[PDB]
Design a protein around this ligand. Structure first.
Ligand SMILES: CC(=O)O[C@H]1C(=O)[C@@]2(C)[C@H]([C@H](OC(=O)c3ccccc3)[C@]3(O)C[C@H](OC(=O)[C@H](O)[C@@H](NC(=O)c4ccccc4)c4ccccc4)C(C)=C1C3(C)C)[C@]1(OC(C)=O)CO[C@@H]1C[C@@H]2O
Ligand SMILES: Nc1nc2c(ncn2[C@@H]2O[C@H](COP(=O)(O)OP(=O)(O)OP(=O)(O)O)[C@@H](O)[C@H]2O)c(=O)[nH]1
Ligand SMILES: Nc1ncnc2c1ncn2[C@@H]1O[C@H](COP(=O)(O)OP(=O)(O)NP(=O)(O)O)[C@@H](O)[C@H]1O
Ligand SMILES: Nc1nc2c(ncn2[C@@H]2O[C@H](COP(=O)(O)OP(=O)(O)O)[C@@H](O)[C@H]2O)c(=O)[nH]1
Ligand SMILES: [Mg+2]
Ligand SMILES: [Mg+2]
Lengths: 428, 382, 426
């Protein structure tokens, strides 16, 4: 009845640095473990000073030394702070083959001591990136090796994914194609967030033009506490992870939702505004609030999962439910009859101290599905195909033993993936 | 400017005394997905066609048709003998290079596919092997003392064996007492001699030809002491992986030179010199499958790094663009004499037959597919 | 996690002598070698350049090589000389004649093993070998000869490492010697085939930098190299210091090298403002990126706008904001969309440190790679075409014993190199 975290990559670490600040904000947890009255991410000590059920992986000693010397070093345990020697240097090859088989016997070792503490484990989630070597090749190792020993649990992926316009390194599409096909081969459910539309929230919902990577990710961090952390907490209509298994994904292999968050209001705008249940549902379908550069109007909605926070009564919801059905500009599918599975919990989202978003009465995370990401998939593929036509940037991976035929293997099957988002509105 | 472009030949694995007892009982027989044919040399592998929600690779087919039918010049199967490959590949051009034509043999494919059984091979069941049947090297060395003797002309058996272990070139025909257990001094003395010049020659007589330092020539009267080529192949570096324990680790370049002289009826001697660049390469190691390790890793990657650079050439040969970069691998500079150069050269495409190794051959199957648009111009020596 | 340093030549020994001056002040260090800095991030990753010993001491992990005695003696006679430990001055008592065909050839060969032992004094005792940094010439002999024979043996001893060097491109403007188009010329026959990367710094632009754009009168060697010295330090800040998007040197080797021969690069320092222009300039994020377009801040003597850029890396310093960092980077990709190549959509690699050096508030480090940097090569290669026909002053070197075949093939080694940028230029 618990849940485990995996943080891979320089992106994947600093994600949790907000999230575990939030997770310790869930109970007033100081750097000791001060809390009354809960066993999801935590074990209890003999003094009762709780500790996370989380795994850190960093191939450099770079990022974690901030973590294990700065603030909130003591809530983690050096059992968990698994640091490494050398980066693979943004390489799917060495991140999967060379350096990856030097730490994996130590990382899988901490699992057998933590997962065995789980009295009937619900699931566990993996954090990585696409561009980072650490988040690419180690994903190729770990997510197959977990299914050797954990073939019957849940494997969530909150994976940071590049923009088709703003990019930070050359071989970023040259990573993700090699990773994702074997990822879809093994992983259960995968989220994707684009910094493109995250920047759009900074200018239009945050209205601040000097963000940090914390401020791009406390946004991502506030999502998860409403995805999962309240599912321990008792509300009206509480959901769990296992209510996504054959629910949200209508196929064996279609598991790609889309996360949005409706109340994103800077503290100046707390008063030219009077929030409601129906307003924030109207915020749920703005194509400028997709967190990925995509328009749902070019695609459809296969499914949609409404997961709510705070003071929420469904009679106020049910009006807004048929409203969006009536005010539809969505081109809804033929195959889903009506399915809007509902999540209603009790807890307000908490205010990040020194943070950004506002003290509200009610909040929404939404999962939906679209064929619009299949465009944004292929928009990265447009960046991907032309680098192969020069056969460029190729010596780092053939020099570390990865085949050209993998690129004919992965991308053509990735194109086969992208062609299989299009089978939604075919047969009718 | 010539149109003597290329030869494209294919032999595959099969009847090797560990192989057929498990494959053909396990999966379909001699070319299961692949459909071996001999006439127009057509062949086409596939996989299972299922209504796949994630459509697998090699789903390009329809009801009762073939796809990627890469029909070639000459393909062969497990049935093709050593002499039958010599009947088509090496034999009908070995009496053509006597006039002064030049050849080069090399292979390419997935690791452990039997490149060194084609190149080197090993002998047959004889108590005394009088240059008995093996790979392509001693069979030409058996025709060496035939067609340079039955022609009854003053010949010159000239050859030199050079290994290439990870961007070097090392002689293995040497006195090589320092490589064995010898006596060095207890302390090092001063180097009174100047620097040493090796391999660093390129001429502008023609182009593509590269002159080398210290060609230790080999001269034999028969195949009696021809185990110096086996003595040289003994020092060629191998290893024991798990994808193939038998497949070699290093890679070699062995040259051939036939200086034959006869005074023709015109009143001049015919100074005809041929070349047979007997070049073997290592296996293109998939290290996650084979399980290479720390020192083995740099021993493994430079093989593929060389084969990558070998792939970096042929795409530019068929491109017809300016300044094809032959200047990364020294093997390419050994190959730039004919890769876009002048004389003859054949290409061996030995690949796998596993259903798990269909996609892994497609990078080779693309390289044999592009293996026709390389232009040359033929000549002999007088 | 550690980097080994080599210096050679009358310049590259002198050039890095200014460099360790700066890295000593990078961490608040006594001229003896005691720590007195205050930043904890100074103290945390000392290891990469230093070898801390007992008595609370610090040893610059560096080997200083010359054939002239008094040059490195002047380093020792000068300040920041006692901060070394003197078991490292590996030299000889013979002049090389400022000759590549002697320093690579004879008088280095009685000094090779004495160098490589101090390598073996260090590199085995290192925790993890990561950097082989060199600083030398291409104009003289000692910067050109001995280092090529180092790389012929160091890579032989360390195939699984990384080879960078800061080699000084000759200036057709300002020089003093004659056979200058040999020393760089025969260096290329060994620099290309055995180094993973090198840069190309030429004084021919450096005089234009300090004099014009920095409002200075007299370009001294202590000041033209102090310009190089910051651009040295900016190569590997993320490997040394914390940062948001930290980048490896090998990462910098990955994204900046499309192809294993085209690996020549160019530095750039972003707050290149004069003394007087401090109180008349506002300092921003596009202020730093503005010099990416500047021809006068490209430290090698080429028009960047002449060719087209292949690859550009940007290594930043300061508490910035990525949205401003990305979109200002985005605009430069959108402002001049003919200046790049087409098949690489993201032409830029970002790199963001968290701490800039003291005194400033923003800094950066330009690392570009374009199809016009070959302009440095056509100047040298055509000078070779005159020296060979008469075989003019060949009678210093044939008595040594280097071959015309070397003069044939290393010549054509250049044409194989240069003529590949113009494949991808136009
Ligand atoms: C009023 C004042 O103090 O001003 C600054 C200063 O304003 C300027 C003018 C400095 C100044 O530099 C020069 O005048 C200069 C002249 C020729 C060649 C190179 C530099 C400065 O010397 C440079 C020096 O910079 C630093 O200390 C940096 O940390 C720098 N350190 C050194 O170079 C250094 C070395 C030995 C001893 C002391 C400092 C650094 C930069 C990058 C990487 C590592 C270190 C400082 C504070 C200044 C002056 C004094 C004017 C500039 O240079 C640097 C490297 O910062 C010139 O372009 C910048 C613009 C700066 O704003
Ligand atoms: N949203 C967001 N993305 C980040 C952040 N940091 C890094 N990234 C993304 O992560 C990608 C690189 O992945 P990293 O985690 O930094 O690198 P890595 O996984 O450690 O692997 P290496 O590249 O080998 O270092 C970049 O493309 C960034 O866009 C962050 O703080 N927030
Ligand atoms: N067409 C073939 N005819 C006969 N035997 C073959 C054939 N193809 C493969 N083999 C066998 O395949 C086995 C394994 O191949 P192997 O020769 O060990 O590796 P490899 O491909 O030659 N690599 P390398 O040694 O590095 O050149 C050998 O024992 C051969 O006998
Ligand atoms: N920046 C700079 N370049 C120098 C200096 N001294 C010499 N050079 C250049 O370096 C080249 C000569 O190499 P040098 O190191 O002096 O001779 P070597 O010791 O025989 O290698 C020429 O291009 C000189 O212009 C100096 O102090 N600073
Ligand atoms: Mg990483
Ligand atoms: Mg074989």
């Amino acid at each position: 009845r618990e849940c485990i975290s995996i943080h891979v990559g320089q992106a994947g670490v600093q994600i949790g640095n907000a999230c575990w600040e939030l997770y310790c904000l869930e109970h007033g947890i100081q750097p000791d473990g001060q809390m009354p009255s809960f066993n999801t991410f935590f074990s209890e000590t003999g003094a009762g000073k709780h500790v996370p059920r989380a795994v850190f992986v960093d191939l450099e000693p770079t990022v974690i030394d901030e973590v294990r010397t700065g603030t909130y070093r003591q809530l983690f345990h050096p059992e968990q702070l698994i640091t490494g020697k050398e980066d693979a240097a943004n390489n799917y090859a060495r991140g999967h083959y060379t350096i990856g088989k030097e730490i994996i016997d130590l990382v899988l070792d901490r699992i057998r001591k933590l997962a065995d503490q789980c009295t009937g484990l619900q699931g566990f989630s993996v954090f990585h990136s696409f561009g980072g070597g650490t988040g690419s090749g180690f994903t190729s190792l770990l997510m197959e090796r977990l299914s050797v020993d954990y073939g019957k649990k849940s494997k969530l992926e909150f994976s940071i994914y590049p923009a088709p316009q703003v990019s930070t390194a050359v071989v970023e599409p040259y990573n993700s194609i090699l990773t994702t096909h074997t990822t879809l081969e093994h992983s259960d459910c995968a989220f994707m967030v684009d910094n493109e539309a995250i920047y759009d929230i900074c200018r239009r919902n945050l209205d601040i033009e000097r963000p940090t990577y914390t401020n791009l990710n406390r946004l991502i961090g506030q999502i998860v506490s409403s995805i999962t952390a309240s599912l321990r907490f008792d509300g009206a209509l509480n959901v769990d992870l296992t209510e996504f298994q054959t629910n949200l994904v209508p196929y064996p292999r279609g598991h790609f939702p889309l996360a949005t968050y409706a109340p994103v209001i800077s503290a100046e705008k707390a008063y030219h505004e009077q929030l409601s249940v129906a307003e924030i549902t109207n915020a749920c379908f703005e194509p400028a609030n997709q967190m990925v550069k995509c328009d749902p109007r070019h695609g459809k909605y296969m499914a949609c999962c409404l997961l709510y926070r705070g003071d929420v009564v469904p009679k106020d919801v049910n009006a807004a439910i048929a409203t969006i059905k009536t005010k539809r500009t969505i081109q809804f599918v033929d195959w889903c009859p009506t399915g809007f599975k509902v999540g209603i919990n009790y807890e307000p989202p908490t205010v990040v101290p020194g943070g950004d978003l506002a003290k509200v009465q009610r909040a929404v995370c939404m999962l939906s599905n679209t064929t619009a990401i299949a465009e944004a998939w292929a928009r990265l593929d447009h960046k991907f195909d032309l680098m192969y036509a020069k056969r460029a940037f190729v010596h780092w991976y053939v020099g570390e033993g990865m085949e050209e035929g993998e690129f004919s293997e992965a991308r053509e099957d990735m194109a086969a993936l992208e062609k299989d988002y299009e089978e939604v509105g075919v047969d009718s | 400017m010539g149109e003597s472009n290329i030869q494209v030949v294919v032999r595959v694995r099969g009847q090797a005394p560990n192989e057929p007892k498990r494959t053909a009982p396990g999966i379909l027989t001699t070319s299961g997905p692949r459909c071996q044919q001999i006439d127009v040399a057509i062949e086409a592998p596939q996989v299972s066609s299922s209504s796949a929600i994630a459509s697998t690779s090699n789903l390009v087919q329809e009801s009762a048709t073939r796809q990627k039918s890469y029909h070639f010049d000459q393909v062969f199967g497990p049935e093709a003998d050593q002499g039958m490959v010599y009947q088509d590949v090496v034999g009908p051009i070995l009496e053509e290079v006597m006039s002064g034509y030049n050849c080069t043999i090399f292979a390419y494919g997935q690791t452990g596919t039997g490149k060194t059984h084609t190149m080197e091979g090993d002998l047959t069941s004889q108590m005394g092997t009088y240059s008995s049947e093996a790979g392509i090297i001693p069979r030409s060395l058996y025709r060496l003392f035939h067609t340079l003797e039955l022609s009854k002309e003053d010949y010159s058996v000239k050859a030199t064996f050079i290994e290439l272990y990870n961007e070097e070139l090392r002689d293995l025909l040497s006195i090589d007492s320092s490589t064995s257990s010898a006596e060095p001094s207890s302390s090092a003395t001063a180097t009174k001699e100047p620097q040493h010049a090796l391999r660093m020659y390129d001429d502008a007589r023609g182009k593509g030809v590269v002159i080398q330092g210290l060609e230790e020539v080999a001269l034999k009267d028969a195949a009696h002491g021809l185990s110096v080529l086996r003595r040289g192949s003994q020092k060629r570096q191998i290893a024991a992986t798990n994808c193939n324990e038998q497949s070699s680790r290093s890679h070699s370049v062995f040259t051939m030179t036939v200086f034959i002289k006869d005074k023709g009826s015109r009143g001049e001697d015919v100074l005809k010199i041929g070349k047979l660049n007997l070049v073997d390469l290592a296996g293109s190691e998939n290290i996650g499958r084979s399980g290479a390790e720390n020192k083995r890793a740099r021993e493994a990657g430079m093989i593929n790094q060389s084969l990558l650079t070998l792939g970096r050439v042929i795409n530019a040969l068929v491109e017809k663009n300016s300044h094809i970069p032959y200047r990364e691998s020294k093997l390419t500079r050994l190959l730039q004499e004919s890769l876009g150069g002048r004389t003859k050269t054949c290409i061996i495409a030995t690949v796998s037959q596993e259903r798990a190794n269909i996609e892994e051959t497609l990078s080779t199957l693309d390289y044999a597919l592009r293996a026709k648009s390389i232009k040359n111009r033929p000549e002999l020596n007088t | 996690r550690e980097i080994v340093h080599i210096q050679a030549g009358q310049c590259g020994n002198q050039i890095g002598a200014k460099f360790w001056e700066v890295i000593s002040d990078e961490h608040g260090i006594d001229p003896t070698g005691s720590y007195h800095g205050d930043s904890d991030l100074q103290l945390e990753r000392i290891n990469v350049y230093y070898n801390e010993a007992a008595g609370n001491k610090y040893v610059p992990r560096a080997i200083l090589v010359d054939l002239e005695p008094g040059t490195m003696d002047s380093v020792r006679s000068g300040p920041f000389g006692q901060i070394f430990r003197p078991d490292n001055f590996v030299f000889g008592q013979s002049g090389a004649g400022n000759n590549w065909a002697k320093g690579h050839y004879t008088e280095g060969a009685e000094l090779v093993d004495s160098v490589l032992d101090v390598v073996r004094k260090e590199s085995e005792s290192c925790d993890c070998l990561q950097g082989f940094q060199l600083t030398h010439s291409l104009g003289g002999g000692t910067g050109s000869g001995m280092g090529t024979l180092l790389i012929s043996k160091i890579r032989e001893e360390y195939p699984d490492r990384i080879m960078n060097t800061f080699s000084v491109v000759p200036s057709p403007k300002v020089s003093d010697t004659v056979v200058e188009p040999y020393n760089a010329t025969l260096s290329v026959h060994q620099l290309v085939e055995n180094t993973d990367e090198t840069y190309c710094i030429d004084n021919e632009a450096l005089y234009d930098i300090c004099f014009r754009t920095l409002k200075l009168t007299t370009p001294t060697y202590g000041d033209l190299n102090h310009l190089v010295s910051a651009t040295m330090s900016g190569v590997t800040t993320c490997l040394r210091f914390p940062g948001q998007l930290n980048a490896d040197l090998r990462k910098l080797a990955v994204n900046m090298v499309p192809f294993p021969r085209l690996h020549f690069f160019m530095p750039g320092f972003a707050p290149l403002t004069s003394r007087g222009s401090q109180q008349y300039r506002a300092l921003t994020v596009p202020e730093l990126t503005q010099q990416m377009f500047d021809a006068k801040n490209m430290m090698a003597a080429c028009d960047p706008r002449h060719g087209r850029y292949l690859t550009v890396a940007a290594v930043f310093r300061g508490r910035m904001s990525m949205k401003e960092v990305d979109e200002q980077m985005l605009n430069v990709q959108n402002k001049n969309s003919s200046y790049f190549v087409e098949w690489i959509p993201n032409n830029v690699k970002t790199a963001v440190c968290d701490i800039p050096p003291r005194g400033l508030k923003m800094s950066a480090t330009f690392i570009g790679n374009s199809t016009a940097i070959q302009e440095l090569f056509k100047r040298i290669s055509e000078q070779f075409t005159a020296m060979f026909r008469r075989k003019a002053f060949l009678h210093w070197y044939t008595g040594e014993g280097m071959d015309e075949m070397e003069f044939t093939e290393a010549e054509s080694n250049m044409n194989d190199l240069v003529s590949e940028y113009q494949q991808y230029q136009d």
